[PDB]
Design a binder for this molecule. Structure first.
Ligand SMILES: *[C@@](C)(CO)[C@](*)(O)[C@H](CC(C)C)NC(=O)[C@H](Cc1ccccc1)NC(=O)[C@H](CC(C)C)NC(=O)[C@H](CCc1ccccc1)NC(=O)CN1CCOCC1
Lengths: 233, 212, 240, 231, 195, 222, 244, 235
């Protein structure tokens, strides 16, 4: 039995024609206090997988160490560690999914929601979710926390089903992700303006973007709003 | 559920309903609440479905192992006590079982043992177990005599379940009848309450509370 | 824990520790079991190099396992106590779970299973003991007599003897015991038992113990004078 | 002599006699052959019988849909080791959703056999194994020895008179390695290889045992009338 | 389980135990014997939590019987009662205690005296001239305080016991379906069939 | 306090024919008022012509299916590639479920296939392992909506022969695979209309002696 | 491994004897003789100390005779250190029985349990047996006055008069010669000392080389008293019987 | 001394090879498998005439569809049978079906090598396990203390095994009837037995799909013994 202390908010992601995009802001909240601002919640594994984690940060750091150790262990007695026997997104996910469910079954969970985004060796897009309960599901768009409520509706307007994936380009997909991050900044009280974004493409590979900012915000209309009903000054 | 079994001149009658509930949701009308342990032993099931079903089939395995080791069919007393000693180990853990081990052996004769999940084990001539046990008792006790014929005893057992199936909201479906003799148990059919009630009402002239 | 495999096979296919345990039985005082038509009698030798004994308190050779079953033995006395204790506990355990006392076959099978377990368990030696288990099953009037031995094998006997000079008394029983007509009465069965011990014992004074077991938990041990009467009667008939 | 009482003792020349005596149990065992191409891997095993009234001892065991082995020596020891492989293959599937590499399979067996050669009380395994499989890096063939030594090969043979089949495969190396996309021809080469280890006896219908795994072929075993094709 | 009484008189101990076994709103049995013979001259009645009662009684019974076989000798009622108390004294600090209250009626053959011991589930032992467990005591003790004499006969004890059962049948809320009466004396244990 | 259970919604349905059996289930996965996936299958081919679904808490559902699939694998290893019969699978699943009697899998399990006489078989399980063979069973969130409809249309309950004065019952008969799929589709469209956790897609697995076939149908996405 | 150095203490010889038990008995046969004699109105325990030195503190010494409880005592023959291990176990066992049944432990029960412990060391555990033989002298209300003996094998037997340790063959012949059933304690005291006096390996039997004890009902009315004799009391009883 | 799990220079386990010598000293047991059933027969070999031969239990039921005969240190077989019976019943509990004869045999043989420095020595007994299942039909297995088991059409174990096996080699064919097999076991037992064969010192049994495993009565076997003697004198 735990209670989360230092927390990370929404992780959002979607599939596009050649790969997957994933994003998450750089905040480490301590309740209502926006305590830590340099927190990286996207963690790459190899050159083909990115694990996005929300929830308790101490448990996130534990998961980082496991993934780091997983890469090391895979390299042992493995001449094809950087080729045919390299770590796949599906391997990394299933490992985490196993751990998450084992921990919930011992009544001592890792208080997180995790999204493993990547590209398989055969070029197929991989995007799957797992959380503290060990619950797993996959979808063309996946999001955690407030992202599930606000980002998914927006991302589903682009990719509403499987057949929309080949029709969606990386430009259109990234634009929707960046828009969703702005909406979350408007409406999620435990979010920050600064965020990281990662693209895993089957052709161009892993592109990790740091220190992005929400921009092109609409605040001007606020000046016209006076009082709460009858005030005209 | 409603289950009964009583001892009489011509052996043992065993009768059960077939309903299974999850709260007010009627989950099944076709549950087998009598377990056939061997040609001379029967076990009735009331309470938690899984608890009864799992541990009474387990009981059957223990009874088989007895007759392999001892080259002799297990006694009704020993069979019941295996089950009672088992549930006693789980006392407090929350098992829910109201069972009756009915059978015949040479040394014992016809015998009935009531065994429940809080460790109670009682030998007796008449028992009714389940949510509708009281309704079954009312009809059974008021019509019971030791000198009942096999035909009348079978009907009284059937009629007592019907009585409970009617009044108890958590009993119904159909009646399963068994008759245990010196030669072993004999199945006396599945009787759907849907047809049985009206057949009994018309022929017997009872159930005048219901709109005919 | 001490793990050593003490009981092991030899090139010729023998387990010497089990066979040396039989030698300990062969050293032990003679014990005999004879079953009649409606009874079983257990006879036991007591060596007479021990005078100044206190027979009130000295452990008796025949031991009650339950009210309806008895156990005598030949071999190591200290080892026998362990088997008797285990058997007595299993007797009460059986009554508790089965709601019925043990059969003589069941009790024998248990004791024999214990003896066997010590022949292939690490860190232990076999029991230097062979037993004669006798009694009557619950609600039964057929006499039962069983034998066990260190190896763990057990079997039923019409009449049997174990211990020192047992081959002599077995020879006697083999020609004197009729399968078609066993000792019809208690007196006949006791006499045949005493006769068989008189082939080996020495004197019929405080050297022979006799215990009679009858149906429905009817067990009694004979006193010196009672046994001496059989000894006196047999010797007078012998001079012929 | 004085240094063969247990596995924990070295001889003066640095030998482990108990490990060598375990190796000897393999030489007494019936011959079995392993060979592979780039697409498929094949096990061929000469089964042995007690007499004409008995059945023929099964030499081949399946470990997963993509991996399995043949045995020579103590069969119960092969059962223990094959069961261990089954679990490890299965652990890899459940936890990582990943088919176990044939190379890791060999490493795991090596380490399991090794622990038995360094500790008091235990004994070495008394069996040799030929593991075949098809994984993400194509077809594979391994040779396991109970000393711990595992070796990846194109082809090999273990058991009594295994030198005959091993010489043949050493000559045929360049031919059978290129039998790609043709199962029956790769088996034929294996059946002709094991034939070089035969004396007085010939390959009959309930004597021969063949197994195969490959690109679009799960690990399957052929016995009885299913091997009559290759005699 | 509810009513268990005990009366020690001049030459015997009389135990009375209710026959009813009730769960819920149903009397499942009206002929239940709430006692076990521990040895030829020692009888134990019991009452308490369902299952625990019999399981405990039979466990004690098996132990006393085992002792009797081992030593070819009958333990005194005092010795048996001390053994029983210790088992309950262990039990109360266990993970799941036996919730069983007992009366041990015995005849000591060495002393030629009847003995009645009352032991509750905590392991609280007392020797008494008359005893009871549960709500029975709230009526029977005061009644016996008045009518009991130490030099009474077994017949006088049975009439005294009838007076208790009548009072209980009058004032107790629950129907306990009468009692099974047993007598323990120099000649062992015997049951009164007509009560 | 940490709550180890959750409700992933959805509903499942099993119907048995004469020489076939179907096991259907919607593809929607939810938590509270949010949709997690519109296509997350929960009806699985487990081998030996046995299809299985464990509806309720998806984590426990997946764990169970995973363990049973593994049980089938080891059954082959230990018993010379013997085919696991549907009755044997059912009993094996009871022990899986009851093994966690004191920390249950929160799922309603249904399996379907063919019995050893080649006839259609459906078995249903409660969370702790009580099981029963039936012609018909719905499980999950919309079971209370679908099940009485099945009683009426599959087992012809409360239906009498016209003009017989409610004396002769409508005779029981096996349904064709075509007629069964009609009932499955209508059951799920009805359930989708009136239950918020049911919708998106319908996936049916049909089992005959020839193997396991699949069919997919769109459902309303609101 | 360690197998090389294992003596295998718990095995049979080809003749069916337990090597270590036999050799432990050989060890005990060199120990100071101890005699127990049971009379109708009490029990005597007499024991010879092993070759005493003149500078040994005699009055505050305990080598042979030990008290188990108020009703039971033992005479030791063999390794003293081994005996004390067993004595503390026996003392505890007696108190467990008293705590359980509120009654003093019957003599045979105590003897059986102590003998069962010895038996264990001959059948399992791979340890050497206890090189000790006991003479138990005690009283209970069932059998009255009782004498037992136990040895390393774990086998125990009851006696009217018995000796353990050195010269038991010669000692047992002398006891068998002069013992009779209607004997009194004071007569048994004389027999015990006379037997030691003849079987001793010393030149002459003196007070400083002896331990002596009686268990009488010589207390006031129906109760048992244990008397462990003081040096001066042994000196007096030795003069009173005319040995010195 | 030396380790329990030691290999000889030839590549065999000393203790397993020595236990095989103990089995050769044991009483003869013969099994014959047919399409109408499997027959199991044993030599009782009473050590003395006072011993009640009906108490000699060398043929044993494992389940209704599986039977067992033994030879060697028969006391060692008790825990092997106990395991087999539990394995058989346990499998029925988990899978609601009879357990395969081969799987049962394999379960028993897994105990065999669980010895060392687990139990202290191998078993000193060989088992003939006969049974029937729906898949492979009527089967006869020979389970050794080496952990190995062979299936046999016919098999003899014990003191007269090599002589009896050579006789079974000639006599066995695939079309043997049950009655023919019964007589064949009696015939071969009478040849290798020391004392003269009769209903008291030899026991027969069989397993059929219909009636399951049955130990024959001494009355039934006696008639088969009489039928056997008449047929041999008839030519
Ligand atoms: C009469 C009818 C009532 O007592 C009979 O006694 C029958 C006995 C027959 C079945 C042997 N008793 C029941 O039907 C019994 C009543 C009951 C239920 C729960 C506890 C005690 C008694 N019913 C059951 O056991 C049902 C049987 C199913 C419906 C076939 N099962 C459940 O209720 C299950 C299991 C409950 C459970 C018990 C112990 C530990 C864990 C769980 N519960 C669920 O399936 C949960 N629920 C169902 C509806 O959907 C939401 C989840």
């Amino acid at each position: 039995t735990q209670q989360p202390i230092v927390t990370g908010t929404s992780v959002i992601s979607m599939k596009y024609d050649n790969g997957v995009i994933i994003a998450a802001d750089n905040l480490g909240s301590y309740g209502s206090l926006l305590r830590f601002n340099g927190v990286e919640r996207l963690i790459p594994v190899g050159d083909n997988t990115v694990v996005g984690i929300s929830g308790d940060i101490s448990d996130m750091q534990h998961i980082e160490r496991l993934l780091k150790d997983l890469v090391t262990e895979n390299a042992y007695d493995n001449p094809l560690a950087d080729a045919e026997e390299a770590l796949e997104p599906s391997y990394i996910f299933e490992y985490l999914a196993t751990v998450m469910y084992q921990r919930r079954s011992k009544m001592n969970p890792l208080w997180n929601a995790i999204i493993v985004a990547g590209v398989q060796s055969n070029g197929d897009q991989f995007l799957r979710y797992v959380n503290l309960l060990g619950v797993t599901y996959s979808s063309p768009t996946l999001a955690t926390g407030f992202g599930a409520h606000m980002a998914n509706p927006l991302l589903r307007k682009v990719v509403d089903r499987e057949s929309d994936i080949p029709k969606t380009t990386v430009q259109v997909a990234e634009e929707a992700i960046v828009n969703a991050m702005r909406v979350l900044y408007y409406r999620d009280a435990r979010s920050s303006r600064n965020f990281s974004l990662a693209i895993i493409d089957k052709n161009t590979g892993l592109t990790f973007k740091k220190n992005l900012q929400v921009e092109n915000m609409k605040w001007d209309f606020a000046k016209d709003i006076k009082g709460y009903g009858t005030q005209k000054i | 559920s409603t289950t009964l079994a009583f001892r009489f001149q011509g052996g043992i009658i065993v009768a059960v309903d077939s309903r299974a509930t999850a709260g007010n949701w009627v989950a099944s009308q076709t549950v087998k609440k009598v377990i056939e342990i061997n040609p001379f032993l029967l076990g009735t099931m009331a309470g938690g479905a899984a608890d009864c079903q799992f541990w009474e089939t387990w009981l059957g395995s223990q009874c088989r192992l007895h007759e392999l080791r001892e080259k002799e069919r297990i006694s009704v007393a020993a069979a019941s006590k295996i089950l009672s000693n088992l549930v006693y180990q789980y006392k407090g853990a929350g098992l829910s079982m109201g069972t009756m081990i009915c059978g015949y052996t040479r040394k014992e004769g016809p015998t009935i043992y009531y065994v429940d999940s809080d460790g109670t084990r009682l030998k007796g001539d008449i028992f009714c177990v389940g949510s509708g046990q009281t309704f079954a008792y009312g009809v059974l006790d008021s019509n019971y005599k030791w000198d009942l014929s096999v035909e009348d005893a079978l009907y009284l057992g059937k009629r007592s379940i019907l009585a409970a199936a009617h009044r108890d909201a958590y009993s119904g479906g159909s009646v399963n009848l068994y008759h245990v003799t010196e030669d072993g148990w004999i199945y006396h059919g599945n009787h759907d309450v849907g047809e049985l009630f009206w057949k009994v009402k018309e022929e017997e002239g009872s159930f005048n509370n219901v709109i005919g | 824990g001490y793990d050593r495999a003490l009981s092991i096979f030899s090139p010729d296919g023998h387990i010497f520790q089990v066979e040396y345990a039989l030698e300990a039985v062969k050293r032990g005082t003679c014990a005999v079991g004879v079953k009649g038509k409606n009874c079983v009698v257990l006879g036991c030798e007591r060596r007479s190099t021990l005078k100044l004994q206190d027979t009130r308190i000295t452990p008796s050779k025949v031991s009650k396992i339950d009210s309806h079953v008895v156990l005598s033995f030949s071999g190591l006395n200290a080892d026998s106590r362990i088997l008797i204790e285990k058997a007595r506990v299993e007797a009460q355990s059986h009554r508790l779970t089965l709601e019925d006392p043990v059969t003589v076959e069941y009790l024998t099978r248990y004791v024999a299973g214990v003896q066997q377990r010590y022949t292939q368990s690490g860190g232990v030696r076999p029991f230097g003991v062979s037993t004669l288990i006798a009694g009557f099953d619950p609600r039964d009037d057929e006499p039962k007599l069983y034998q066990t031995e260190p190896s763990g094998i057990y079997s039923s006997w019409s009449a049997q003897t174990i211990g020192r000079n047992s081959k002599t008394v077995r020879e006697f029983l083999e020609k004197n015991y009729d399968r078609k007509e066993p000792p019809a009465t208690v007196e006949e069965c006791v006499k045949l038992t005493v006769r068989s011990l008189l082939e080996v014992v020495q004197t019929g004074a405080k050297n022979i113990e006799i215990t009679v077991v009858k149906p429905d938990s009817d067990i009694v041990a004979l006193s010196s004078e009672e046994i001496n009467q059989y000894v006196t009667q047999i010797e007078q008939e012998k001079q012929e | 002599n004085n240094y063969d009482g247990d596995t924990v003792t070295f001889s003066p020349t640095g030998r482990l006699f108990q490990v060598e005596y375990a190796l000897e149990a393999i030489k007494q065992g019936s011959v079995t052959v392993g060979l592979r191409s780039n697409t498929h891997a094949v096990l061929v095993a000469l089964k042995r019988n007690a007499d004409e009234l008995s059945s023929y001892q099964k030499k081949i065991i399946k470990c997963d849909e993509h991996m399995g082995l043949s045995l020579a020596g103590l069969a119960p020891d092969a059962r223990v080791l094959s069961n261990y492989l089954r679990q490890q293959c299965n652990y890899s599937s459940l936890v990582f959703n990943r088919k176990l590499a044939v190379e890791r399979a060999g490493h795991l067996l090596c380490d399991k056999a090794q622990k038995n050669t360094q500790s008091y009380g235990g004994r070495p395994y008394g069996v040799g194994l030929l593991i075949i499989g098809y994984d993400k890096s194509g077809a594979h063939l391994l040779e396991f020895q109970p000393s711990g030594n595992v070796t990846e090969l194109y082809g090999t043979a273990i058991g009594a008179r295994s030198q005959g089949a091993k010489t043949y495969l050493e000559r045929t190396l360049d031919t059978f390695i290129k039998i790609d996309g043709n199962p029956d021809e790769l088996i034929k080469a294996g059946v002709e290889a094991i034939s070089q280890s035969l004396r007085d006896e010939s390959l009959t219908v309930d004597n021969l045992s063949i197994a195969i795994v490959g690109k679009d072929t799960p690990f399957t075993i052929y016995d009885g009338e299913a091997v009559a094709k290759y005699i | 389980m509810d009513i268990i009484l005990g009366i020690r008189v001049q030459d015997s101990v009389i135990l009375a135990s209710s026959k009813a076994v009730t769960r819920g709103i149903s009397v499942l049995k009206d002929s239940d014997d709430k006692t076990r013979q521990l040895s030829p001259h020692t009888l134990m009645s019991f009452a308490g939590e369902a299952g625990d009662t019999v399981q405990f009684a039979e466990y004690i019974q098996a132990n006393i019987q085992l002792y009797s076989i081992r030593e070819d000798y009958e333990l005194s009622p005092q010795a048996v009662s001390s053994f029983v108390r210790q088992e309950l004294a262990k039990s109360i600090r266990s993970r799941r205690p036996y919730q069983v209250n007992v009366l041990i009626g015995g005849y000591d053959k060495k002393k030629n005296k009847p003995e009645l011991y009352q032991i509750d589930y905590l392991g609280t032992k007392v020797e008494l001239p008359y005893g009871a467990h549960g709500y029975s005591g709230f009526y029977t003790f005061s009644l016996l305080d008045h009518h009991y004499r130490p030099d009474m006969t077994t017949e006088e004890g049975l009439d005294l016991l009838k007076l208790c059962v009548q009072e209980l049948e009058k004032r107790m809320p629950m129907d306990f379906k009468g009692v099974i009466v047993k007598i323990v004396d120099k000649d062992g244990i015997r049951q009164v069939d007509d009560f | 306090q940490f709550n180890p259970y959750g409700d992933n919604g959805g509903t499942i349905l099993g119907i048995a024919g004469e020489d076939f059996a179907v096991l259907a289930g919607d593809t929607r996965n939810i938590t509270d008022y949010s949709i997690n996936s519109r296509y997350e299958p929960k009806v699985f081919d487990c081998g030996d012509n046995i299809v299985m679904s464990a509806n309720g808490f998806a984590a426990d559902g997946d764990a169970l299916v995973k363990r049973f699939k593994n049980s089938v694998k080891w059954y082959h290893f230990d018993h010379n590639d013997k085919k696991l019969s549907i009755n044997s699978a059912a009993r094996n699943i009871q022990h899986l479920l009851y093994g966690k009697r004191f920390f249950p899998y929160y799922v309603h399990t249904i399996i379907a296939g063919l019995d050893e006489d080649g006839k259609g078989a459906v078995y249903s399980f409660d969370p702790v392992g009580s099981y029963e063979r039936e012609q018909c069973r719905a499980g999950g969130a919309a079971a209370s909506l679908i099940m009485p409809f099945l009683d009426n249309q599959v087992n012809f309950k409360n239906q009498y022969e016209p003009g017989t004065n409610g004396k002769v019952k409508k005779p029981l008969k096996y349904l064709s695979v075509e007629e069964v799929i009609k009932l499955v589709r209508d059951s799920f469209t009805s359930a989708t209309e009136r239950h918020i956790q049911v919708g998106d897609g319908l996936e049916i697995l049909i089992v005959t002696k020839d193997g396991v076939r699949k069919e997919f149908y769109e459902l309303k996405r609101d | 491994g360690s197998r090389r150095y294992d003596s295998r203490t718990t095995i049979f010889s080809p003749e069916g004897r337990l090597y270590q038990v036999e050799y432990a008995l050989e060890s005990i046969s060199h120990a100071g003789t101890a005699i127990g004699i049971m009379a109708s109105d009490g029990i005597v325990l007499a024991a010879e100390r092993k070759v005493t030195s003149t500078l040994l503190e005699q009055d505050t010494s305990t080598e042979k005779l030990y008290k188990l409880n108020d009703k039971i005592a033992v005479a030791v023959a063999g390794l003293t250190a081994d005996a004390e291990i067993l004595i503390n176990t026996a003392r505890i066992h007696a108190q467990n029985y008293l705590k359980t049944y509120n009654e003093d432990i019957p003599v045979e029960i105590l003897v059986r349990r102590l003998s069962d412990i010895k038996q264990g060391y001959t059948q399992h555990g791979g340890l050497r047996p206890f090189g000790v033989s006991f003479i138990y002298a005690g009283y209970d209300d069932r059998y009255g006055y009782q004498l037992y003996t136990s040895n390393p094998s774990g086998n125990y037997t009851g006696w009217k008069a018995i000796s353990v340790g050195a010269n038991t063959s010669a000692a047992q012949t002398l006891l068998q010669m002069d013992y009779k059933d209607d004997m009194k304690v004071d007569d048994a005291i004389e027999l015990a000392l006379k037997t030691l006096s003849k079987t001793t390996d010393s030149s002459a039997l003196t007070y400083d080389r002896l331990e002596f004890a009686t268990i009488r009902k010589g207390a006031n009315d129906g109760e048992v008293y244990q008397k462990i004799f003081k040096p001066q009391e042994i000196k007096d009883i030795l003069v009173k019987t005319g040995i010195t | 001394d030396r380790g329990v799990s030691t290999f000889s220079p030839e590549g065999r386990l000393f203790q397993v090879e020595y236990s095989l010598e103990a089995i050769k000293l044991g009483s003869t047991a013969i099994g014959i498998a047919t399409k109408e059933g499997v027959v199991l027969g044993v030599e009782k070999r009473a050590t003395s005439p006072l011993l009640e031969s009906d108490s000699i239990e060398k043929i044993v039921e494992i389940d209704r569809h599986i039977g067992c005969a033994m030879s060697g240190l028969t006391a060692d077989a008790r825990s092997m049978i106990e395991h087999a019976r539990t394995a058989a019943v346990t499998h029925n509990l988990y899978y609601d079906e009879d357990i395969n004869v081969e799987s049962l045999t394999q379960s028993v043989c897994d105990l065999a090598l669980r010895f060392g420095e687990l139990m202290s020595r191998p078993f000193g007994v060989a088992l003939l396990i006969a049974g029937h299942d729906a898949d492979d039909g009527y089967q006869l297995f020979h389970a050794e203390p080496s952990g190995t088991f062979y299936r046999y059409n016919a098999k003899a174990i014990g003191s007269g095994s090599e002589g009896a096996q050579a006789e079974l080699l000639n006599e066995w064919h695939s079309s043997l009837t049950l009655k023919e097999a019964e007589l064949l076991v009696l015939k071969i037992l009478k040849q290798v037995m020391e004392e003269k064969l009769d209903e008291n010192n030899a026991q027969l049994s069989c397993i059929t799909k219909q009636d399951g495993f049955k130990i024959y009565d001494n009355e039934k076997t006696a008639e088969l013994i009489k039928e056997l003697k008449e047929k041999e004198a008839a030519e």
